[PDB]
Design a protein around this ligand. Structure first.
Ligand SMILES: N=C(N)NCCC[C@@H](C(=O)O)N1CCC1=O
Ligand SMILES: O=C(O)CCC(=O)C(=O)O
Ligand SMILES: [Fe+3]
Length: 315
């Protein structure tokens, strides 16, 4: 699902201006400011976000296109390391992630991942491990983010400050609502609420993940093409059928500056196709944040946007 927000550029730049200019120096205060500001988002945007937050969509994602973003010459050089300096001045796309994110829920950091930071720069790095956001020429295969984590976030948000030079990197999204009809009843039944072994991402180095769960007529999805590891042959067969159906309903988003993609991380799996970096200071640069909501299991009470949580595997 996509919406063009170009007309709201002036209003959104004004809301971004309300926020503290050094977010990381006091992230709780920054996000509280973003929460107050999210109450004044343009009506069209507030409605679109509230609707997607409550109902999801058939395609599992909401793409906000044409949000404000700096001219390329005014952006810093694309980062070459992580984590980001705490004193880094606020970037417009980060302000959008603050506003849109707080309208949806609570930004969450994960202790063992990216030093526990909340805002992650997603850029290519030479010699990247194959299972990392730093990859470029190697396809980053389908994964439901932290599917193996008990405190897995409802949304993964990606805002784009720079696309890759040739605009070949595609963010792929496959939705359980489109894939499910393609599976037979026995396969659905086998997957539903059935715990299967799942490895974890490098940062967290098992877990048990239910590939499908919840209401049988509209289940949630937990899938990872690299980490999910069924052993029983019936389980492997069912996951292979699920994998094929997800491929068959794959949709692609070519992120460009000003785009903010909201992925329903309980109903999709996502990936990124290859691109060739130039190491010239203008390489692809996205900003990633994770949002927790009241959808069950994520929050137990007293949480604030900006909190960092520890690792506990599902099981
Ligand atoms: N199939 C996979 N699990 N691929 C790795 C996903 C990217 C990775 C990263 O940020 O480098 N990550 C996502 C959460 C985490 O860690
Ligand atoms: O680069 C992208 O478009 C998505 C990256 C991603 O999914 C990840 O690093 O977890
Ligand atoms: Fe991801």
């Amino acid at each position: 699902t996509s919406v063009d927000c170009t007309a709201y550029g002036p209003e959104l730049r004004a809301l971004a201006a309300r926020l503290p200019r050094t977010p990381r120096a006091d992230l709780y205060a920054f996000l509280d400011a973003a929460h107050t500001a999210a109450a004044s988002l343009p009506g069209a945007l507030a409605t679109a976000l509230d609707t997607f937050n409550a109902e999801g969509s058939e395609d599992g994602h909401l793409l906000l296109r044409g949000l404000p973003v700096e001219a390329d010459a005014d952006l810093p050089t694309t980062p070459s390391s992580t984590p980001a300096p705490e004193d880094r001045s606020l970037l417009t796309m980060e302000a959008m992630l603050g506003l849109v994110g707080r309208r949806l829920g609570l930004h969450t950091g994960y202790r063992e991942l990216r030093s526990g930071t909340v805002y992650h720069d997603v850029y290519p790095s030479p010699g990247a491990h194959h299972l990392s956001s730093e990859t470029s020429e190697t396809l980053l295969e389908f994964h439901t983010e932290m599917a193996y984590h008990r405190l897995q976030p409802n949304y993964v948000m990606l805002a784009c400050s720079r696309a890759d030079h040739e605009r070949t990197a595609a963010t792929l999204v496959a939705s359980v609502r489109k894939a499910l009809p393609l599976l037979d009843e026995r396969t659905r039944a086998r997957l539903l609420d059935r715990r299967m072994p799942c490895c974890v991402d490098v940062a967290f180095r098992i877990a048990q993940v239910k590939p499908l769960y919840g209401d049988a007529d509209d289940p949630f999805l937990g899938y990872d093409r690299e980490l999910l590891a069924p052993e029983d042959p019936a389980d492997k067969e069912a996951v292979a059928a699920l994998s094929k159906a997800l491929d068959e309903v794959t949709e692609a988003v070519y992120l460009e500056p000003g785009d903010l993609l909201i992925v329903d991380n309980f109903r999709t799996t996502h990936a990124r196709t290859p691109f060739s970096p130039r190491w010239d200071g203008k390489d692809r640069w996205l900003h990633r944040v994770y949002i927790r909501t009241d959808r069950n299991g994520q929050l137990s009470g007293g949480e604030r946007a900006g909190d960092v949580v520890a690792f506990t595997p599902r099981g």
